[PDB]
Every structure is written in structure tokens, then in C-alpha cells.
Amino acid sequence: MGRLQEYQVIGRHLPTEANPNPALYRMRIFAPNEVVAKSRFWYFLRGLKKVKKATGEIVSVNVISEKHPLKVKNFGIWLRYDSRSGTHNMYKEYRETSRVAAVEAMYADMAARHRARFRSIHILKVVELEKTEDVKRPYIKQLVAKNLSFPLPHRVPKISTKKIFSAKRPSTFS
Amino acid sequence: PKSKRARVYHLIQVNKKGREAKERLFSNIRETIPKYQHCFVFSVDNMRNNYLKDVRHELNDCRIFFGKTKLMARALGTTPEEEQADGLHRLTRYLTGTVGLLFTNRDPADIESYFSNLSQVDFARAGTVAPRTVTVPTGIVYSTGGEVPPEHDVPVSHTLEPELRRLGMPVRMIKGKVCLGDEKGEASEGYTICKEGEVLDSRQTRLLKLFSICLSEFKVSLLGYWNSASGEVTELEAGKTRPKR
RNA sequence: AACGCGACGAUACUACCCGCACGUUGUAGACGUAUAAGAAUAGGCUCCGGCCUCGUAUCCUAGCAGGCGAUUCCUCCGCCGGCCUCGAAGUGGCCGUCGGUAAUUCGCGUAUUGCAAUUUAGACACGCGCGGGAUCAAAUCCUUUGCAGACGACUUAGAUGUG
RNA sequence: GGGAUAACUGGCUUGUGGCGGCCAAGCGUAGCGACGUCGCUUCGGCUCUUCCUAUCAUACCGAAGCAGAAUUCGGUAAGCGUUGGAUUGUUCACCCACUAAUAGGGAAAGCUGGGGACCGUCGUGAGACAGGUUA
RNA sequence: AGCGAAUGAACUUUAAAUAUGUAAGAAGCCCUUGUUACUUAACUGAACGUGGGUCGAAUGUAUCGACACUAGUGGGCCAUUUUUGGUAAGCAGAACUGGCGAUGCGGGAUGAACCGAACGCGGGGUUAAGGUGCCGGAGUGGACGCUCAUCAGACACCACAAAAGGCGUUAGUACAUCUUGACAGCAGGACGGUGGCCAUGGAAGUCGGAAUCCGCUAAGGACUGUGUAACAACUCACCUGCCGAAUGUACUAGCCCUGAAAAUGGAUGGCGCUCAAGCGU
RNA sequence: CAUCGGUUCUGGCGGGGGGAUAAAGGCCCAGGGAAUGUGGCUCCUCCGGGAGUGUUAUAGCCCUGGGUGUAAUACCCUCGCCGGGACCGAGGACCGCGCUCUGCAAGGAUGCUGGCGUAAUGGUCACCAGCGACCCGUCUUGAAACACGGACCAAGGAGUCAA
Numbered sequence A: 001m002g003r004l005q006e007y008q009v010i011g012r013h014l015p016t017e018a019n020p021n022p023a024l025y026r027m028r029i030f031a032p033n034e035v036v037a038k039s040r041f042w043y044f045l046r047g048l049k050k051v052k053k054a055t056g057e058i059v060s061v062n063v064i065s066e067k068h069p070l071k072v073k074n075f076g077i078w079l080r081y082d083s084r085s086g087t088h089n090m091y092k093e094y095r096e097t098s099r100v101a102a103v104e105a106m107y108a109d110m111a112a113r114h115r116a117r118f119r120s121i122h123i124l125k126v127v128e129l130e131k132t133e134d135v136k137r138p139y140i141k142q143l144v145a146k147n148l149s150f151p152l153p154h155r156v157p158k159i160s161t162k163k164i165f166s167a168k169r170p171s172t173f174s
Numbered sequence B: 001p002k003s004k005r006a007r008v009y010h011l012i013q014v015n016k017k018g019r020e021a022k023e024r025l026f027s028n029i030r031e032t033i034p035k036y037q038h039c040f041v042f043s044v045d046n047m048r049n050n051y052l053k054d055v056r057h058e059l060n061d062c063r064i065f066f067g068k069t070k071l072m073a074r075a076l077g078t079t080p081e082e083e084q085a086d087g088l089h090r091l092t093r094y095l096t097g098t099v100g101l102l103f104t105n106r107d108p109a110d111i112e113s114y115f116s117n118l119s120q121v122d123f124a125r126a127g128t129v130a131p132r133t134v135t136v137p138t139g140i141v142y143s144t145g146g147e148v149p150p151e152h153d154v155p156v157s158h159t160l161e162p163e164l165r166r167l168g169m170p171v172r173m174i175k176g177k178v179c180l181g182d183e184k185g186e187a188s189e190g191y192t193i194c195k196e197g198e199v200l201d202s203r204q205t206r207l208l209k210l211f212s213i214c215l216s217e218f219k220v221s222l223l224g225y226w227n228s229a230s231g232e233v234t235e236l237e238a239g240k241t242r243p244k245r
Numbered sequence C: 001a002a003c004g005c006g007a008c009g010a011u012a013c014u015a016c017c018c019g020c021a022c023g024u025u026g027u028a029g030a031c032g033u034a035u036a037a038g039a040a041u042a043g044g045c046u047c048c049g050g051c052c053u054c055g056u057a058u059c060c061u062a063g064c065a066g067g068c069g070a071u072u073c074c075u076c077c078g079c080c081g082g083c084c085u086c087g088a089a090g091u092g093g094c095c096g097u098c099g100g101u102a103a104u105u106c107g108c109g110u111a112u113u114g115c116a117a118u119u120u121a122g123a124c125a126c127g128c129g130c131g132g133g134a135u136c137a138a139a140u141c142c143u144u145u146g147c148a149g150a151c152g153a154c155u156u157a158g159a160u161g162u163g
Numbered sequence D: 001g002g003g004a005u006a007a008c009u010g011g012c013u014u015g016u017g018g019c020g021g022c023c024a025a026g027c028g029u030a031g032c033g034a035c036g037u038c039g040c041u042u043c044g045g046c047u048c049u050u051c052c053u054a055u056c057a058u059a060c061c062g063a064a065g066c067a068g069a070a071u072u073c074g075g076u077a078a079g080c081g082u083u084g085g086a087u088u089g090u091u092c093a094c095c096c097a098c099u100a101a102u103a104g105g106g107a108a109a110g111c112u113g114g115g116g117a118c119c120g121u122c123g124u125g126a127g128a129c130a131g132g133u134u135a
Numbered sequence E: 001a002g003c004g005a006a007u008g009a010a011c012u013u014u015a016a017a018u019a020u021g022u023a024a025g026a027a028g029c030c031c032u033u034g035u036u037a038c039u040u041a042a043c044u045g046a047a048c049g050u051g052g053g054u055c056g057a058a059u060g061u062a063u064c065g066a067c068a069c070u071a072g073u074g075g076g077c078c079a080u081u082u083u084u085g086g087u088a089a090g091c092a093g094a095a096c097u098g099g100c101g102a103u104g105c106g107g108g109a110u111g112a113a114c115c116g117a118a119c120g121c122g123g124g125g126u127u128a129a130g131g132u133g134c135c136g137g138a139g140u141g142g143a144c145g146c147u148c149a150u151c152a153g154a155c156a157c158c159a160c161a162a163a164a165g166g167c168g169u170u171a172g173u174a175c176a177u178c179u180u181g182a183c184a185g186c187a188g189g190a191c192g193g194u195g196g197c198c199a200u201g202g203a204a205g206u207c208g209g210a211a212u213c214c215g216c217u218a219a220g221g222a223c224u225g226u227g228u229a230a231c232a233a234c235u236c237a238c239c240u241g242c243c244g245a246a247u248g249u250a251c252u253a254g255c256c257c258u259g260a261a262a263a264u265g266g267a268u269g270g271c272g273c274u275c276a277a278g279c280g281u
Numbered sequence F: 001c002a003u004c005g006g007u008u009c010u011g012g013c014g015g016g017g018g019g020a021u022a023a024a025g026g027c028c029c030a031g032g033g034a035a036u037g038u039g040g041c042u043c044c045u046c047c048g049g050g051a052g053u054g055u056u057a058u059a060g061c062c063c064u065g066g067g068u069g070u071a072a073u074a075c076c077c078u079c080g081c082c083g084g085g086a087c088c089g090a091g092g093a094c095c096g097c098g099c100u101c102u103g104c105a106a107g108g109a110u111g112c113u114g115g116c117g118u119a120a121u122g123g124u125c126a127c128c129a130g131c132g133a134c135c136c137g138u139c140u141u142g143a144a145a146c147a148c149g150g151a152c153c154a155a156g157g158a159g160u161c162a163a
Helices: A034-048 A099-114 A138-143 B019-035 B052-058 B069-076 B108-117 B158-166 B202-210
Strands: A005-013 A025-031 A056-064 A073-082 A087-096 A121-128 B038-043 B063-065 B099-104 B120-122 B134-136 B172-174 B177-179 B191-194 B216-218 B221-227
Touching: A005 A034, A005 A099, A025 A034, A034 A056, A073 A099, A087 A099, A087 A138, A099 A121, B019 B063, B019 B069, B019 B099, B038 B108, B052 B063, B069 B099, B108 B221, B158 B172, B158 B177, B158 B202, B191 B202
Parallel strands: none
Antiparallel strands: A005 A025, A005 A056, A073 A087, A073 A121, B038 B099, B038 B221, B063 B099, B120 B216, B134 B191, B172 B177
């Protein structure tokens, strides 16, 4: 959702006399900005571990940029969302150019198909399918077909919304 | 998604076999192979094969296998490496369609004599060419269809009228008797089931069976066999003109 | 439909029609108020060559608010007639006469509205004036009738007659 | 005699009982647990206009040993109708017929028959008063 | 959290969220020796005195306190959170805080209890809540999907309402079958002991009771339906050939239909809106 | 209209800094690999095109490291410079802070010009138009609602005096 970037967030518990040099945990977080990125770090850590914001410290926040934002890739996202019944696992595939593009599409798709919100979705794994034959979903499988070429029937032309009256009836062929 | 036909769960005693029967079929053939001296491959192309049971009784010292062609082919081994005995892979070349195996301890010429003198009359089955024209006489239809003389025949059962009419016979019940036209036999002409030299379909074949009219012949055609002693497969009359695997 | 519409008859004055002369007259609002195929949108148009996202197109578009005289041009515009065509709440075409007319190129004129002030300019309707043609009407009150009626309203009859 | 209180209901209502056991997908990690099955059983009359359908009849359909006739159960349907007497013996108030049938409700309504509350006095194991006042 | 620390909400090294009482200076703390009628065994304590040492957290401060006098006030309604008890469901009672009472203005079509925001007379700029298809100022704005309802939906999400009915549609989970040929189909087999035993006028797989085995097998039930007076005959289960690549079952999550409605004609505010002018981001 | 001051809306341009001293990318260097397998080869082939083999050839692609390289660009933050509008001009000798000093944009608008000099601006009424807008008082109540008073006008009409 929004515009997202991958964030490498490393945080630690505040060093005490008994426990110097703490564990230095790490996560990858999709957030619109660095303020949200740190909040998700402590929200996730408060669940998993017993480290809180008061006794915590953010070591580094870094942006992970996609290595090849010009290569078309197939992504597989393993996510968990909770509904009125419970928490469910689902695996879905997105054909995109960057991981942030894939995750943004997932948030839109989960909202459209299951009315799931950002607070309800946990992103467990996003992976680049290194090769075809790793694509399981038929909608992605048809896009990776050999010699793909399709027409675009019934294309509605773009007429300025301030051009109320047209002299000729438009055509929907090109 | 939705809008699918409902699969009926049959309240039945016998289920589908699947993998267990296949493995059982492999074991039965593989243990049979060492026990016999010859392995015959025979063909029953478009036959009803209800007489194969009588063949088993006559050949009680032999073993006949009539299963899936692919299962029987690889049970014998289709390549020299997975083959069980020498020359078996070239026997599997004969296994193409509806065929069977005949393990015997007999003289090979004895088997040819038995299966060449064996001949039984059976029903047609679709695809066969009609050797004669069959016509039901116009009038009171009998339980044979103008083959046994009517004086020696009995009228057809009245519960067969919907079944006969479904296959296309314009019959009617007149006072409890199925009739073609009128009981006197003057209202209409007869019914021609099959004509001379014409391929007959299941509609015509079914009509022949209820009238107990046999138009085809049951005969087993031997394609070739394999000698355990010599490990060499020979070629019999039928096989030279028949597609191979 | 008592604030929807059509056809027809007769309309005295007033001014009914025609022409032009204006209005210190009204307008939910001129300023180039320009532009007709039908049909489909998983198809269509054609000149039969080809063409189609796209009306950011086509037409018209110069001149003292648009003068005068030429040079040069048969192009465009307008009024009248004749023949026809237009009815869904009715018009355009063809021909002829006359008038105007940069497609090219000049000569004379513009000043002073003073450095901007709506560039008062169109169409319809209405009214006032002349000069040409044309016409000489009805309704109501009243008396009467009863096919009508609380009263109005209504069907009638009153001019010479089958009153 | 004192205290809290004007009073109730408004997506209300309708056709299938309660209790106990067995089974029971799940939730959960013992407890809740539906459908089935077993066990025990003020009132009446008078009305006109319109609306509703939860249809008694008339129209059309589906099914039933529905032979015919007559029906029964169900569906779409409110277009069209839904009576005259008794109420003079008994009761859970309801017989006589005629008719195609003699369905049920809402607008909730007016006529007509049936069938007061405070003090005062004298007493209270209990009432009496032509004693006073009043909306 | 652990019990690779001991012991076993009632265990603990440590320790949540959450409100909440008290205290934070020279109007202060301790020491000291003079007296005293108090006290002690005692110049010993206590009180009354003497002297000593950056004014001891942050933030704000539109002044604080004492005394006297004077007028209007003595109610409550609703909501959040916590909490006590109860009902079939309602509901009744406490504590705090907030809104209304003395309040105008913007929005929710309208309005005691909702959201925004508080007020001298004017000009300019920018916003909040709420909105930008037309009433109506501002988008027939952009991206990806979902949905077709015989009175959809447009923020009521409580009740009807369930472990509910849908051969509507989309996404997903688990299990299972498949070139050893899966699902669907077509062409054929579906046999023998055996009309198994009892019963029946009759009863042979198919009016009934009970057993339900073996052979041949590729497979075929002492039989799933039609049928006969009883047979016969057909059909199903199951098997094979042809065909050829993906299927089946059960659940979950969205949106859609039903999940009960009476009676003057009317309501997402109205027109109306379907790759929306509906739903999610 | 020109030059200013205050406030504000809205365009463009020139630099600086920071990430992985962006990530990518173009051109080179050295490795490795694969297919939705380019050529080549084989078999089917109906103009057409399929199936198979194998690693760049008569296309290319992926991954790793290095060079150009302190590359460019996006995003974030920053220093300035020009442009186009709108509203406003409070004060009235000097004084002050200042600067780019014959002076100035520095403690608040001046300069130049035009038409008109009268209903022209302006004001009062009545009306049309767009948006807005419950009928007052009393009483009760937490509040509404009910209830009570109100046909209209003129004059009179109610916290005074004494102790």
C-alpha cells in the first residue's frame, strides 16, 4: 500500500551491567517511511521477543533497493491474514519488477479479494522464483507462456473530460 | 467453483481396485513365467469374450492372462534390461491392443490345432459388417424376429416394448401383445434392422441381441509365442498383418 | 390541460396586407451564435488507389465599422420573378434579370476619440409614421324556447319567413 | 405513615413443547455444543369507503388407485364476489338452509343493547354516619 | 520468562499495561551545651535557648494569601471506561471523566445526546469535519481487483440468523487419483457352485428373516434399481478396449440470492447510477 | 500606468549535500550457467510450422568480481535568482536601527496621466433575482412537547411613602 521501500532495521536491548553486547536482532520491513519502519520493528519484536521500546535501541535503518529494477520477475509471497474465523496461510504469486511492487500489489489484492487490511496481514516470506516450473498459479503460468502475443479488443479511446460534445461517434478498434 | 454435477456415492459392496490389483497382476505373471515352457500371445479383436471362460476350463493345465495391455507388457519386460527371460521383450512387441497371454506346457502345434478348429457363433458388436439382412415380419412380433418359424416361437415379452421402441421399432401393445402395425399384419410393412454389407451400430446390435440373432463369429487368433528353452519368438499367420507396439 | 395543439369562417373602426423610417419599447443574455448521411464498435469508410486513436478538423476569414478611382477577374454573395419541390411543430433546388464582389497589383483618404473606458452595430416581438392596395363584422344585454335549470350556464327562436 | 416511580410497547409479531440421555463438525486442550432418536405427557350488534393476502369461490397449473363422476394436497394469482333466517329448549352458544362460496384482517371509529376521593366523629377481634368538602 | 536459578493467582531472579496516595528546603536538617517544676540510675533524654553550615528536579505563572461585608445558587438528562447484581431478552445500582444546561458557527438531506470548532465590525489567505455525476462549490480523477440483486448497494452492522439453505462467482487450505492412462463418455464383459438356508399358493440377487463363502478371475454384490405370478430381460457396482492431461472430495475467506411480510402513495434526501455515481485498499 | 512597502497564491532556473559516496544502466575485462534453446543438425511435415539434440555460432539471456567512476538520474534535505496575479497604503516636520552611501526598497504611498465635474459616484424607498431564516410571551421540566395569553389602535397601567 502507498509507496513502499524495503527497510533493514537492526535493533537491540539496551546494554545492562549483567548483559553487555546484546543480541542485535534484524528484520526486513515494508513501510512508507522510516518512522513507520521503526514502529513495525518494535511491534513485531514485542510479540516475538521480550524487548520493548523503552529498553530498546535502533542500531541502523537502511533502504534495500532492488538489484535489477529493469528485469521482469515472478514473485511468490507466503503470508498470513486473520479473519473473523482465525489466522490463515496463503501462498500467492505476483509478476512484477521489484519486491516493493510485488508487496504493494499483494496489499491491494488482499483488500480487494478478502477485505483484509494492513493491520491484519503478516508477510512471512517474499521470494523470487529463480526459474519457471516454480510457478504454480495458472494466471502467472499463462503470462510465462511461449511466444505470448495478444490483441487488445474493445479499446475505449481517451477523450478529455472537458470535451463534452463530439461531432463524430468514436471507434473502439485502435 | 460452484455449478458442478453431483457425483453419486453408490451404496455398493465392491470398490475400485487401483494400485493393489496392478501389483497383484505383476506378481501373478512374474511367478507364472518360470513354470511354463511356452508363452502364447493371442488376439480377440472385436469380440464379446464371454467364451474365454470355456477356454480356461478346456485348457486347465494352462494359464490365461487377460488384463491391461500396458500392465502385461511391462510385467513381461519391454526392454532387454528389465526383461525377465531371454527374448521376452520381443514378445511384448505383439502386445498392442485387446490381447491375452497363454502360458502352456504343450506342443505348440497342438495349440494351433485347438484354436483353429474352435468356432462359436456370437452376437455382432458394433463395427462388424452385416452378412445378412434381418427383417422383423409385419404383425405380431415374436421372441426371435422371424428366424425361428412363428409356429414354433412364442410372442415377445410385453415389458420389451419401451426398450424396442427406444431403439426405433414402431411397435404397440394390442391386447397385451406387442405388434408391428396390426395383429393381423396388414397395417404397415416390416422393420429392417440391418442391410447387406453395412456397418452396424450399437442400436442395431442391441436389437439383434434381444431377438437372440447371432450374426458374428467368436474365434481366437494366435499372433505368436515364445519358447523358454530357445528364448526365441516365432511368427504366426495372424501377426504379419497387425499393427505392432 | 379552464396558462396543450390543429384546421376553417367572418373580422366595423382601430388600422388588415405590402414597402421603408425610426423607436430615448421589451427580451434568463448575438458578436463567424457557420458545419444533416445511415449503421456497426469482436468493425467501418471509399473516388475501389486506399483510408480510420485524435473536430488541436472543414468552411469562411485582408479593405474609412471597411471610403474613392483604377489595374485585373468570371469567383462568391443578395433581391426579385418562372418551374418545381419541402407537412413530424412545413422549405430548399434549378434557371433568368439586376446589384455588389482583392484571385494579382497600385494611387489618393484616415491624424485631434489626444496613453484604456460595452468596438450603443444581431435576431425576434411590440409601437409610432408616411404611401400603395383591401374590407364594411360580430358577441352580449333584451324578448322567447324547455331537449335545460338552485342562480349562472345550456338547447332554441326573434330582420318578410315552411316566421 | 415514609422512600423510589406518571405507565407500557415500537425493524415488535407468525408453524412446528419442555426436561434428561446417546450421537455430534467444531471451539478448546475438562466445559459450550445443532439436526436426529430414545424416555414422560367489559362484551355483543350496526355500518359505509379503501387497502392487505395469510385465497372460501371463480381462471390456469403440479401431484395422488385420480377408471368416469366427485374430490384431496400443493403453486401463480386480490381481476371478480363472499347470503337469507334463527337467536323462541340445553350447552364447549350454533343450528336451518340457499349459494359458485357463504375466507381472514388493517385504517381503531362512533351509535346501540347487555352487563368517584379527602377530612371529621363514634367504634374497631368490625364497621357506622341525611357529618363536612371537592375535580 | 524460566524451572540447562531453587521451591511448587496461591513458584520466583526480574518484571508488564493501567490508573493512584504521600514528599521534594533557609516557613530546612543534624549536632551542641545552659536552664527547667517533665523524665532518667546519671548532665541523662524532651521542651525552652545559642552557634555552624550551590537556596538544592522539569515546565508554567494573565499574581498569592489573610480578614470583613454583599447578591444569585441547592436540580438533573445522556454517553465512555471500570465495577456489583439479574433476565429468555430487557435491565437496576455505584465511581471517574466528558457533553447539555448560560453557546452562536461548519458538516451528518432533517434533528436535545454525533464529528469539527468556539463568537466585536470588515478585507485577503489557509484549513478541519465532510465532500468533488446533477441538484451543489470542488474529479464522470488515477492504480489493482470484487459484485448483476424479480424494488442490489451506497456505513445501522444489533436482531431476524443457525453446526442454515444456493448445479452463483472469485481467491485459498488440506487430503486424494493420474502416460503403471486419472475425471467424463462410447463399445463390450458383469460368469460358476447356485432356483445358497428358512419361509411362502407362488418368491430363482431384487414381498420377507438370517448368514453372506468359495471358484474363474481382468472383474463381477449370495446383489443397487426397473421388471415377471415365478422366470426371463434390462440396469448399477466392478473390469477391459478406444480416447488423452489434468482431475476429485471436504473445508476456509470475500461479494451476490434466500434466510418472512401485512395493510392511504413514497423514498440510500431526490433524480438516477452496473469495467458504477456500488464494495476494499 | 510606473516605482515601492505589508500579506499571500502560483510558474520557471542556477548550485550544494546524503544514501550501497543511490540502486540501476552504456561501453570494456575475467569467469560460471541455463532455457520459454538462436544458429547448425535429424525426423515429421498441407502453403505454414512443429518435435528432438545441444550452450552462441548467422539472436540473445542469467549470475559473480573488476574498470570507466567521486558517471548520470530518481527520492530526501538544503543555498539562492528571475516571472505572473490578488488584497491592503494604517501614520503624518526631524529623531532610530541600518545599507549597496552625491544616496537608499532603512521607524506604514508616492510619481505621471485621462475622462467627468453632474445625479456621474453615492444614499433612501418599492420590486424582481440567488442564498439564508419556526410565532411571540408565560409556566413546567434535565429537556422538549402539551397547556395558558395574543382581532386591531390610542390613552392609563404596577418595588412608593413613613417609622
